Nucleic acid binder design. Sequence first.
RNA 1: GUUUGACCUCAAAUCAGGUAGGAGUACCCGCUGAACUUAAGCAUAUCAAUAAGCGGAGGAAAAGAAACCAACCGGGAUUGCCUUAGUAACGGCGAGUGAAGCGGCAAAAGCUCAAAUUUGAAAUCUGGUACCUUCGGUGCCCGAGUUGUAAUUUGGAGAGGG
RNA 2: GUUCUUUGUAAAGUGCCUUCGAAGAGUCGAGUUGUUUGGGAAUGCAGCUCUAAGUGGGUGGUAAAUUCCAUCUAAAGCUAA
Lengths: 180, 85, 143, 52, 192, 99, 60
Amino acid sequence: GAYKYLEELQRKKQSDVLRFLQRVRVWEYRQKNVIHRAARPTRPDKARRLGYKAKQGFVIYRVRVRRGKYQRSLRATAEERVGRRAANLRVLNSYWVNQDSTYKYFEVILVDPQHKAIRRDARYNWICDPVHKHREARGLTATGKKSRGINKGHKFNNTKAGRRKTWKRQNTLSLWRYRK
Amino acid sequence: FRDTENLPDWFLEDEKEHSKINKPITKEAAMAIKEKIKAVTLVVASGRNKGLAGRPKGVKGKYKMVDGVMKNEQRALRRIAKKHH
Amino acid sequence: PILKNHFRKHWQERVKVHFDQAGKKVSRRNARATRAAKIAPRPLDLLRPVVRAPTVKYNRKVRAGRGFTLAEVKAAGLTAAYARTIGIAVDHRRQNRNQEIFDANVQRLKEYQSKIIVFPRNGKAPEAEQVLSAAATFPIAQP
Amino acid sequence: SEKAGHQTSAESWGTGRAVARIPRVGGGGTGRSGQGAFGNMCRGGRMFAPTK
Amino acid sequence: RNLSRYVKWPEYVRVQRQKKILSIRLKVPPTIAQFQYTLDRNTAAETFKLFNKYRPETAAEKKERLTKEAAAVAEGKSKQDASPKPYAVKYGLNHVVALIENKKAKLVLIANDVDPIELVVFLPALCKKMGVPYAIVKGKARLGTLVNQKTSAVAALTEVRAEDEAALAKLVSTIDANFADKYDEVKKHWGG
Amino acid sequence: TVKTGIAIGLNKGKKVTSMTPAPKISYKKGAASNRTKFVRSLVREIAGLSPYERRLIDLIRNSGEKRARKVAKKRLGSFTRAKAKVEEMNNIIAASRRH
Amino acid sequence: QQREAVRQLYKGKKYQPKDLRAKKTRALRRALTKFEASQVTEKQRKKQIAFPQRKYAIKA
RNA sequence: GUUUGACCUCAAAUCAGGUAGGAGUACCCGCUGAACUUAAGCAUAUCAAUAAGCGGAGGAAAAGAAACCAACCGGGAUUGCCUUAGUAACGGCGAGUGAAGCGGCAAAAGCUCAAAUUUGAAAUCUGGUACCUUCGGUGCCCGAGUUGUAAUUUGGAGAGGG
RNA sequence: GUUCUUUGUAAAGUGCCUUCGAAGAGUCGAGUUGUUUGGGAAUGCAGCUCUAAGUGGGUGGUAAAUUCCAUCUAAAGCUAA
């Protein structure tokens, strides 16, 4: 397949060819709007390994944000922007495309949970449960989880299960009927 | 790298609008921008004037009501400051 | 002397007082009961292995661990996918590096498979009159 | 309750107005105004060692 | 006066026309721009006279075939021999490039105009290095014609019935005579 | 590996029979393979070279591998990464000026 | 009478109108059907076929 | 061939069908975020990674089947409780702050995608429409889709060949 | 407990031998700043800059480095109590 050839290529981000292509694509998108739809994705393999499958309901939007202290990411900022735009849609994940000196350009894999192909095909029926609404704004996609500080171990003690939960857990006095 | 005479100026403007320099913060500038960011009518309050939470008849932009308990208090404070010297 | 409070903060809000104790206990015992009436002939708990614990302060002990290994249960002659249904825990990220422990676990498994009767999927399902703890029936003793 | 007596809008009238220094109420119109609150002694005020 | 050069066009129009202008005016690597040292016409016409014979099965013919072999499987026979070996284009990208390095493709056709061109930038090198009969074509919708899609971006031949073997042989000889001598230089011709 | 029977030493602890388990499959994860070698080499010659790698190959040739090691360890982060990268550059330079 | 006659007219077909569709609640016009939550891939279908939770008991 | 036409990209429609807002907000995930106060005048620091503010959801949420903990005869996803402990560590080593593993215990459930070619048969799917036993199914038809939908496989492994 | 449907060239499991075995990039990591932590000389996160490998990588933090040894497999995802 083309999976690995594409992938190993796109890692080589400072080859002349991809930096050329990046220059063209930035000029293209920069004349375009901030938020817009792409019908088809730029890094299809990357998107596929982040959970796209090309069928009716999976959507792309391509998006521009500013750079230049903001403990969240630009990535997640973009995702809030599109979640507020297309609120029916549900954000699965996102990926870099390109950047500039001034901006960073991103892309996002989305779902329309009303669409019946999605409601069936139970690799993706999990999402039409109401819980995974507006994930990006609760930080439940992968960069949300990074910025929450959610991975494992004694390195990440102060945020492992939610910073605020464990803060309330350990800054509270527990008192029994029978004081120990 | 980025040639100019071949290419069209309508591309060149939006190219060199944003093909900017790479510079992060330096420490002395951090503390420096932090430093830049750094920046009467007394009234014996008896008779008619008493219990008025507003103004009395007698008007001025400053005003100060008194009853005798303040005289006791400030007497005590004059005593204790004398004893503090 | 040195003596330490942590009471400088706004603590009075965040006080959590366990009056809830016997009520919770009763709720729990009801959980056990109805779990039983759901799972009717099964024991409410799995069979669990025997593991020598870490951290030399404790490493003399042995403990009811998580899960029998693929190697152990293979040598007992049966798979993960069957054992998990038969009531047997499996922890895959564990390795067997003590033959004593190995033979202990497999003796425990054999004793289990001997001590059970399995209703098949076919039908008639005889009366079996459950016991409600594997670990009591299959105890875990220091050698 | 945590908030008996605390459900009020007071602060004093102050020093030297021929009246006490209980914290007293703002507003008017109703006849609660000028009454005291946020106290132990006062009507409608909070008790001493609010039982917990 | 007709003022067609003076008008204010729409935006996306402006984008695409400026884009083509820009891709013209830009210096390019040699990897891409072996594209547009692409194929000429009469060979393409012959190529499609060939390929349309080995066009695929459509749904109608598939269900018709299925009804037939449903008729024959039960009483008489099927080892999937009730029907013959079918022979037609292999068209999917992943499958095609999987067939390569086995390697089985007699001929390869590569669209130039694919928008994430990184999909296919590796391919000419690949078929060069494996020594396999590739050629670039003009327009992917053509391939969509011949394998029953809007477009496909690649067409591959691995199997052909016997009558066309030498026809293919001369075909690949032609494109070898177009690439081995004059679009061998696709990386060459730095100006001076 | 074999323990001593005692609290302290080179192999401290309880002296016990081992098993020498199977290896998990999840250690041979960084394994290359015929396919990945093929494609990575392909993409290597196709896209070729970044600018700092150009600086590396000329600098190795003129001013040697000590300078190349330090400057690569600076453009990249770390020591062992700079090691493999300059070793790869030696392989490239051998490739280009032998064949 | 009118409502039920229209029920008979639009009977036995999808896309029946809004007032006659059920009211129930917002997140139970959502909150997917029994079929879509019953739905499961062929893989787990086989898995649950072959190795389901058998029923057992410990006496003997 | 100055005509006709695939397709790409982009637009519209009181198109067919759907859908998001708002409230509530004790609990919960996040963002932004001070002061009084406390301490040597106080600046670091503390009150506080708090209250207020903004966004987001459910009936539970969140986290979760190790890129873990350890250094031993090794344990074994997450969670909560007790215990470590008011320790290790930090800090005008002053105010003062301030954890985790091991252990006991309640509950205990395991797993999926990308990444293999179906290539002797896109094997998949929405939608329109008729019929029917309708939390739906059969068939006919427009159509998405190879810039990859189904099946197989997910590291405990697993695939292909015999 | 009932009745019909039914495992057939269908699906799945299990042994021996053989060739394999793909495993996520502006991402990890490093610098520097800010912010926060109990985190010590970077515990975490963000921004800016740099930018990787595959018998690899992360981690196990000594006033300094090099190699050991151990253990796990990131950058993608689900799940009641």
